[PDB]
Each structure stands twice: as C-alpha cells, then as structure tokens.
Amino acid sequence: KTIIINGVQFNTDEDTTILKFARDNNIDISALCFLNNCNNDINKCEICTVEVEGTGLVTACDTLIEDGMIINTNSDAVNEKIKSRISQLLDIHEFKCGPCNRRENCEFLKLVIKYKARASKPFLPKDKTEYVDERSKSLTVDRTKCLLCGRCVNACGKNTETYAMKFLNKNGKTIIGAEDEKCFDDTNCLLCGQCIIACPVAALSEKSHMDRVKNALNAPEKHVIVAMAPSVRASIGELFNMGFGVDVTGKIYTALRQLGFDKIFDINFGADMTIMEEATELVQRIENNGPFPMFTSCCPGWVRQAENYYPELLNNLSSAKSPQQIFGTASKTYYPSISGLDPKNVFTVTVMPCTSKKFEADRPQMEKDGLRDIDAVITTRELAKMIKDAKIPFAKLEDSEADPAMGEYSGAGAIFGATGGVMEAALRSAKDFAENAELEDIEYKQVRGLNGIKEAEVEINNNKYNVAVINGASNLFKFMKSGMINEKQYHFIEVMACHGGCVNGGGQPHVNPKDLEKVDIKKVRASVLYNQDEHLSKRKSHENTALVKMYQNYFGKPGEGRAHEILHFKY
Ligand code: SF4
Ligand code: SF4
Ligand code: SF4
Ligand code: SF4
Ligand code: FES
Ligand SMILES: [Mg+2]
Ligand SMILES: [Mg+2]
Ligand SMILES: [Mg+2]
C-alpha cells in the first residue's frame, strides 16, 4: 500500500486504521470515543475526523488504510468539524472545572483547549438531582459531565462481559446507567469500576468516603487506623508527576502521618493473614481429598460475579476473609488487646485501588459486636486528593516506616496486587504446610503475567494438583462457558475481576490513552510489587514475625477454632 498523509508518502503492508497508522508515525490525530480498540459505533464522536481525497471527511479511528489514500489531518474543513463536535458537547456539559474532580487530568478539557471550542449555549443545570446518582456504595454518576462517548459501556463489555453499564432512553434523552436505571448495586454489576477508568471526564467516579475519613480523623475520641493495599505503593506516584513504576511505599507512610492518621498499618499484613487462613484451608481440603475446586474469595468484584451468575460456586469459595476484611476484623479484636484502645473508638480506614472494596466493607454482616471490620475505604485517587488538599509535598517527603504490629509484611503479601499474586503467595505457604518443610524454590512464574487464563500443575506431597488463575471477569465467563473448567479436576482457582489484578483496579489513577500507548501500565505497576518480593528477607506469609506473634498470642491455630470463627466469612 502507498498512503499519503499530510503530503508525506508511506509504503506499508500493514492492515490497520488511519488513526493507528498515523500515531505509529507521529502524526497527530485527536480521538475521544476511541479506546480499548473500539469506538462508539452509534453516535460516533467524530473527533478523529480526517479528510480523504475523493471521499471527504471520515473517522480515522475506524477507517482502514487503503492503497491510494491521500489523507489530510489538519485542513480547515477537518478542524471546523472537530471544533463543531466539541462545541456541541459543551452544549450538554456543565463546564465548571474549578471544583471538578478531573480538573488536572481531563481529556475533554484538553480537547476544548486544543480546538478553542465554546458552547453555543452554556449548560447550567438547576436540578442535578436529575443528573446525579449516588445510591451505590461504590460508583457515582454525574450526567452533567457525560459526553455519551460510550467508553464505559465498551469497557464494561470488554472487561466484564456483563454490560451492566448501558445506554438507556429516558423520555427521548439518551443516558448511560444500569439496567432499568436501577442502582448499580441492585444489578449484576460487579462494582469493579472499569467503567470509571475508561471515562475521559468526571462523569463516573467512586462513591466518596473522604468525609467519613475526615470526620473520623477530627473526632477527638476516634483512633484512626489506616492501611493501604499492595497496589497503592506502585501507583499513587503517577498523580504527583513522578512517572510510572515508582515505589513510593515510604512516602505514603509519611504522608499518612501528616494527614493525622493515628496508626499506620498495611493491608499486606492482612494479605499474609488471608494466606495463613487460605493456605491452611487448601491443605485441609487436600487432606480430606475435597471439596474441589477451592476458589479465592479476596476480590469482591469476583464475589459479586459469583453471586450474580454462578451462585453454585459460593460454597466453593475459601471462607478466609479478604486481606481488607481480615485485617479489619483483627483491628477491632487483636489490636485493642495489644494497645488498650476501646474497640468502639477504633476507626479502620483502608486505601484501595478498588471501588468494589467499598461495597465489601459495607456488607451488613462484615462486623462483629456492632463494630464494623472496616469503617471507610478510599481509593488511590481519593488519597491523592486528600494529600493535595492538605498541601503535602509528596514527591519531596522522606521515607518512614509502618507501625509494625499490623504493618509488617512478607514478599508473598506484597505481590497480591498482580494477577497470579494470591496464587503464588498461597502456594508458597500451602507447600510448606502440607510437606512440613521450609522449601527454597518459591517462585511460581507460570501463574504470572497478563494471559487471560493461566494454569499450572503443582506437586504437593507426592500428588499433582491443578491450579488456575483467571485474570479478568470476562475470562471467568470464558473459563466457565467454554467448559475449560471441565477439562481436568481443578483444586485451587484464583479469580480477579480486573485484568492485570488489582494494579489495574477501578480506583486507580486515570492514565491518558496516549500514555497507555507508551507504557504497559499493568506490567509496570506489578513490577514494583515483584521487585519488593525479590528484596524482602521474608517471602512467605507464615514467616511474617508480627503475624506469627499475633497468632501465637491471640488467634491460635489458623483455619480452626477461634481463627475460623473470627477471621472467616461464608456467602
Ligand atoms: S469533566 Fe473535564 S471539562 Fe468537564 S468540568 Fe470537569 S474538568 Fe472541566
Ligand atoms: S460516563 Fe464517561 S465514558 Fe460513559 S458515556 Fe459518559 S462520558 Fe463517556
Ligand atoms: S462497575 Fe464493572 S461491571 Fe459495573 S458497570 Fe462498571 S465496568 Fe461494568
Ligand atoms: S481485581 Fe482488585 S481492584 Fe479489581 S475488583 Fe477485584 S479486588 Fe477490586
Ligand atoms: S474517536 Fe473516532 S469516532 Fe470517536
Ligand atoms: Mg467501531
Ligand atoms: Mg484524630
Ligand atoms: Mg475454612
């Protein structure tokens, strides 16, 4: 093929779109509704318009290059069209960036600036009740910002295959929303937030827990614990212009102190707890030659997928609480026992890459004696915003350490944030428990990385066992619907709702589609976790010295008795 673009000749055998070809050859073409290799097929944004001689204006993002094409990306006709489309969007957009939670990284604002576009008639709604939906424990919709670009609908379809996010017709007006305009929680929605990550604007957001947290921090009698997820320390630096793949563990700890939190713990300690419990459960099932498979139960997106689509699997879930809830339960029981705090005054906050964690933390039965396991959950984004509002100079902060009693973690806990992390961590402990040894080969590289469905055969004490790692909620559906689950007896299966694992959660920093072209965000975020695992002296959960003291002195034997009554949960 011979293609001419902006007067430049290319000879190529590529079968691809004008947009992709252009960007591979450093020619600028704007795009808005194109993401995840699809665009909005029914009301195309046309922001990727280019001129093809002999044809006229075409959308670059979904038009294949053809021998003979002469393309202009920057003619007057092209810029007037794009500008016009942006102006029409401004007519349905409450353009007030000051207070807007996307002010610093909005794709639309950038386009508005780029083409110097203006509304024909400013949109200034007087009743946002109509436009805002805050019923969900995890997601919020603000339709005054919604461009009807369809990226959330497409992202939900590709990432989950639930299509819980849909276009809806509301008396002649098109909106997005859940089935029948219900609260998302009341539908098959997983509450994973992949739709938020796909949104170019402030139209979708996490349900804020920031007021919960600030009220608690300012309440004199509340002792506010905070603990962050594995993924936050690999991610939050992005939002302070530190670049990608930066380990900021120590800066976070210092930042949390400066925000006024009273105790700095770490959910990776909770991850080591989950393993203590679940690896023990796996050995029990192995000893009792059943029941199989056991599924992980740490990802609440997957738990909702099971509840909504495979309720017959709920009995197969490990009864170990997730790192978050297990940690939270311990923070109301063990931690008062070693600190003297009145348990009612402990307020336990997590920092999560995840929107679905807010739903999990607010589950009615996730409490004991009237005390919630977890009182508040803020996303990575929310924490970033709290830090910025407090004017903490995050990139400049010095490293500090977590408080050790519920803050130490092993390398096994550290890699939880990546797909295959839980599997690898659990196998490190299950192999030791079952064989009563302290094995040296602990790296299970076969369960790592971005393949959608990953499997491995593992030897545990003279028998072969089959494990699987399902990476993405859409891959759960594939694994089940294709009957892959029936090709062999599976013994232990990890499921994560977000492809890449939690490092790609719905609570994570947005990344500009351009940067996504440069960086594999899933791999670069995960790399921080695996690097920690490599450089930690303890790389097995049951080697965590703080955790071991906690079990010796308070919980007893994992997976039975007290530990089973307190730290487990069945759906
Ligand atoms: S979504 Fe973007 S353009 Fe719209 S008000 Fe917020 S920052 Fe401004
Ligand atoms: S909520 Fe966001 S991604 Fe979904 S259609 Fe509106 S602007 Fe696009
Ligand atoms: S939270 Fe997940 S399942 Fe629900 S609409 Fe968004 S992408 Fe779909
Ligand atoms: S994979 Fe992690 S971030 Fe995604 S829904 Fe599950 S727990 Fe949340
Ligand atoms: S980016 Fe091509 S039609 Fe929207
Ligand atoms: Mg298309
Ligand atoms: Mg306080
Ligand atoms: Mg059990």
UniProtKB/Swiss-Prot annotation:
Keyword set, alphabetical order: 4Fe-4S, Iron, Iron-sulfur, Metal-binding, Oxidoreductase, Repeat
Positions annotated to bind [4Fe-4S] cluster 1: 93, 97, 100, 106
CDD domains assigned to the protein according to its UniProt record, in alphabetical order: fer2
Cofactor: [2Fe-2S] cluster; [4Fe-4S] cluster; Fe(2+)
Domain 2Fe-2S ferredoxin-type: 1-77
Domain 4Fe-4S ferredoxin-type residue range list: 137-166, 180-209
Residues reported to bind [4Fe-4S] cluster 4: 299, 354, 498, 502
Binding site for [2Fe-2S] cluster: 33, 45, 48, 61
List of residues binding [4Fe-4S] cluster 3: 156, 189, 192, 195
Domain 4Fe-4S His(Cys)3-ligated-type intervals: 77-116
The keyword Transport belongs to this UniProt entry's keyword annotation: no
E.C. designation(s): 1.12.7.2
Chain sites annotated for binding Fe(2+): 502
PANTHER family from the UniProt entry: NITRATE, FORMATE, IRON DEHYDROGENASE
Protein name: Iron hydrogenase 1
Protein's organism: Clostridium pasteurianum
